[PDB]
Structure formats: C-alpha cells, structure tokens
Design a protein around this ligand. Structure first.
Ligand SMILES: Nc1ncnc2c1ncn2[C@@H]1O[C@H](COP(=O)(O)OP(=O)(O)O)[C@@H](O)[C@H]1O
Length: 283
C-alpha cells in the first residue's frame, strides 16, 4: 500500500483509514475536527507514474512521466469541479479540494456501504428483480441530473456505484484522471470499460451513451457478466436478448428494458433516462 497512515493530519482533517486503493487514487475515511464529522478524502495517486516519498509527499517514478502526471492531476481537478456543480443525494458531494504533497485532494461526503461490484461479488443473493426495481429510481435520478445540466458520465459500471446501507446508490467517480492518463500514455485498456462502453465511445455521444452502460450494469446484475464488447457486436452481434435467455425470477418487462438499453446503435436505445424509466411501466 502507498497510503497515508492513520493519524496523518491535513490541518483540521485526520486520516482514519485507507478504505480504497486503486491504480489511480486512494480513498480514505477521515475526520474533520472543526466540524466534528466523518468525511472521505480522495488522493490522486497514479501508481504507474508516481511513488510515495519518505516524507509522504508524492514524487515521479521517472522524469519522463511529468507531463502525463500533470494532465491526470488537471483532469482530477476538473472532475472535482464537475461534481461540485451538484447537490444531489445520488451524486458524490464534494466538500473540500486542495493541493499538497505534490498531488491533489478532494474532501467529500462519506458514504456508508460498498460498491455495487463488491455487493454483487459478496451478496449476489440480495440482488433480485425487486431490489433492482428499488435501485433504479434513485439511480435514474442521479444520472438524469448529470444529463440535465449538459454533461455525460461516460464511465458507468458496477465499480463506481456505491450502495449505501440504506441501499440508495451514489455515483462516485467519472474516471477522468485515469482516462486522461490512458489516452496520453496509449494505455487504451484503462480508457473504456469493455462490455459497458457502447460503440460510439470507441470513436454521436449523448444520454444514450450512459443508458447503454446502465443496461450493461443491469445485465451484469441479472446474469452475472456484462454483454459482449460493443465493437465485437458491431461486426457480428452475438448478444442474446435477455427476453430469450429468460433468467429465472425476472419479468419480461425488466428484461426488455435491459435489452433496449443495450441496443447496438444509439438511435435504437431509449434516448433519455425518462424514456428508459417509462419502459418499466405498464406492468
Ligand atoms: N465518498 C466515499 N465514501 C465512502 N466510500 C467511498 C467514497 N468514495 C469511494 N469510496 C470507496 O472506495 C473504494 C475504492 O476501491 P476499492 O476497490 O475498495 O479498493 P481496495 O481494493 O483497496 O478495497 C470503494 O470500495 C468505494 O466504496
């Protein structure tokens, strides 16, 4: 682990535990001693570019990585600014942003629970149609709020949807820094998410781009894995509609909603979140 230790201080903030560590940042449970509340802190930390120094600042692993490191940092800042536009229960709420230690930090609201990816791995028996139909209204609302302000998410999968103990979802992360680093470094494999990214993301984008990825999330919850990579589908579509697979315990109405979200071409999908939600009605 490259994480700051428990007890580390940023003025009034104290690190309590590193609770998430990926290749591009570290998430900490932390405590604000001024406001006496638990928060999360997200630290930009691209491990392929940078390492932890003895004084716990961040330094480049090689001088050739400086431009890509700074571009990732700039994208991290821009993502914090985008999230700072919203005050919505289903979108990560940005409290704090600052630069220190050669990197950058976002202080955010602390959310209970775990990611949808971890819930699906640990308690797949909890995920049934009734649970999915309770998940969708707040998840729809969160995505639609992004869309209504003129933005797209473009990185939806199970990994960046938090499921709180209340079961309410939170969108945590748009992958901006990761995706910028991948584009600049020709590490294409960290830019799009195979099976979740629709065809128009591989090089025309709009709400239907996020709707496809949400369809792919739902497909993963229902049958356990995402649909085929969209570029492979565009050559020869081996996607088997869920209405034909008929997984046990799932209604044609929900299965058809997933299939429509996963329509290969953008124009054949629901065009807005509201359109997709309307598909779940009439039953
Ligand atoms: N604002 C937040 N509040 C609470 N948890 C968060 C917040 N932002 C991110 N997380 C958590 O950070 C984790 C990031 O990656 P994860 O896969 O857990 O790494 P690790 O392999 O170290 O467990 C996720 O589990 C997610 O639940």
């Amino acid at each position: 682990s490259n994480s700051l230790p428990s007890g580390y201080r940023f003025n009034e903030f104290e690190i309590q535990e590193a609770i998430g560590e990926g290749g591009f940042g570290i998430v900490y449970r932390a405590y604000d001693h001024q406001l006496e509340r638990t928060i999360a802190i997200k630290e930009y930390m691209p491990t392929s570019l940078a390492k932890r120094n003895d004084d716990l600042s961040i330094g480049l692993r090689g001088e050739r990585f400086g431009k890509t490191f700074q571009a990732g940092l700039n994208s991290f800042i821009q993502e914090a600014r985008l999230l700072a536009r919203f005050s919505h229960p289903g979108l990560l709420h940005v409290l704090r942003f600052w630069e220190e230690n050669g990197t950058a930090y976002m202080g955010t609201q602390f959310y209970s629970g775990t990611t949808l990816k971890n819930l699906q791995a640990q308690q797949p028996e909890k995920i049934d149609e009734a649970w999915i139909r309770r998940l969708l209204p707040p998840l729809f609302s969160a995505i639609n709020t992004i869309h209504q302000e003129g933005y797209l998410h473009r990185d939806i999968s199970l990994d960046n949807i938090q499921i709180q103990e209340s079961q309410l979802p939170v969108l945590l992360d748009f992958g901006s820094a990761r995706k910028e680093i991948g584009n600049l470094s020709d590490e294409t494999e960290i830019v799009l998410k195979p099976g979740f990214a629709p065809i128009e993301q591989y090089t025309e984008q709009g709400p239907w781009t996020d709707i496809y990825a949400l369809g792919a999330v739902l497909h993963t919850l229902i049958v356990g894995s995402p649909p085929p990579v969209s570029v492979v589908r565009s050559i020869e579509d081996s996607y088997q509609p869920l209405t034909e697979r008929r997984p046990a315990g799932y209604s044609p109405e929900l299965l058809r909603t997933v299939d429509r979200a996963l329509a290969l071409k953008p124009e054949d999908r629901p065009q807005t979140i509201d359109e997709m939600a309307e598909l779940l009605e009439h039953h």
